[PDB]
Design a protein around this ligand. Structure first.
Ligand SMILES: NC(=O)c1ccc[n+]([C@@H]2O[C@H](COP(=O)([O-])OP(=O)(O)OC[C@H]3O[C@@H](n4cnc5c(N)ncnc54)[C@H](OP(=O)(O)O)[C@@H]3O)[C@@H](O)[C@H]2O)c1
Ligand SMILES: C[C@H](O)[C@H](O)C1=Nc2c(nc(N)[nH]c2=O)NC1
Ligand SMILES: [Ca+2]
Ligand SMILES: [Hg+2]
Length: 186
């Protein structure tokens, strides 16, 4: 795989979840941004792949599984088989990337997105491969029990602009947030 993509929404203390879900009530617009980004491939006949950890997979309402129009791969060292509705199950990010390269997929997959949680983002972050990080910064503090790993500001340079990412601070339900994109070039 040529380059990875990661997408996350974080709050002021870099928290990404609490009690198995998101720390804020629903942000319609933020959610549509995540959907659009992860779903949109730029090659007819291909779909994007999404990789996620176990807790994250189970965090999605059962009836909404798997993420429509994307190949859902879950990582777990415990499961023997793919949870009902996941497309594939993998033992490490490595196994995941290797799978992605296999012939069956290679031709079926455009973009690879990492959608968390902590350990997955971390793993993806340390891979010395080209990587773009789509972070949504919610300018408010909510109680969180889970957090986003530390971004190496030395490796990941913040772009000042990116095609199709609103520039200004957004507001919805009285909350302000901003879209950022960081890039690591290998
Ligand atoms: N705000 C956001 O953008 C965002 C994005 C994602 C998730 N969330 C939130 O974060 C929480 C879920 O995240 P989390 O970090 O706690 O859980 P997680 O990363 O989704 O899941 C943990 C499990 O996944 C498997 N796993 C994780 N990384 C692995 C690796 N490299 N290789 C193999 N298996 C690996 C392991 O399963 P086994 O124990 O079976 O080995 C590990 O116990 C929920 O609150 C969710 O709502 C928020
Ligand atoms: C996929 C599952 O909803 C997971 O919690 C994620 N949520 C979000 C995400 N990325 C953003 N920007 N927003 C979300 O709400 N990445 C993953
Ligand atoms: Ca476990
Ligand atoms: Hg927070």
């Amino acid at each position: 795989v040529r380059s990875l993509n990661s997408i996350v929404a974080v709050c002021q203390n870099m928290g990404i979840g609490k009690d198995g879900n998101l720390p804020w009530p629903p942000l319609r617009n933020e959610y549509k941004y995540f959907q659009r980004m992860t779903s949109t491939s730029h090659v007819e006949g291909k779909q994007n792949a999404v990789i996620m950890g176990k807790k994250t997979w189970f965090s999605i309402p059962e009836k909404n599984r798997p993420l429509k129009d994307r190949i859902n791969i879950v990582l777990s060292r415990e499961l023997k088989e793919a949870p009902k509705g996941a497309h594939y199950l993998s033992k490490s990010l490595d196994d995941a990337l290797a799978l992605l390269d296999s012939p069956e997929l290679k031709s079926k997959v455009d973009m690879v997105w990492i959608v968390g949680g902590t350990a997955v983002y971390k793993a993806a972050m340390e891979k010395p491969i080209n990587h773009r990080l789509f972070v949504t910064r919610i300018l408010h503090e909510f109680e969180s029990d889970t957090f986003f790993p530390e971004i190496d500001y030395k490796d990941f340079k913040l772009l000042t602009e990116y095609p199709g990412v609103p520039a200004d601070i957004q507001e919805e339900d009285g909350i302000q947030y901003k879209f950022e994109v960081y890039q690591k070039s290998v």
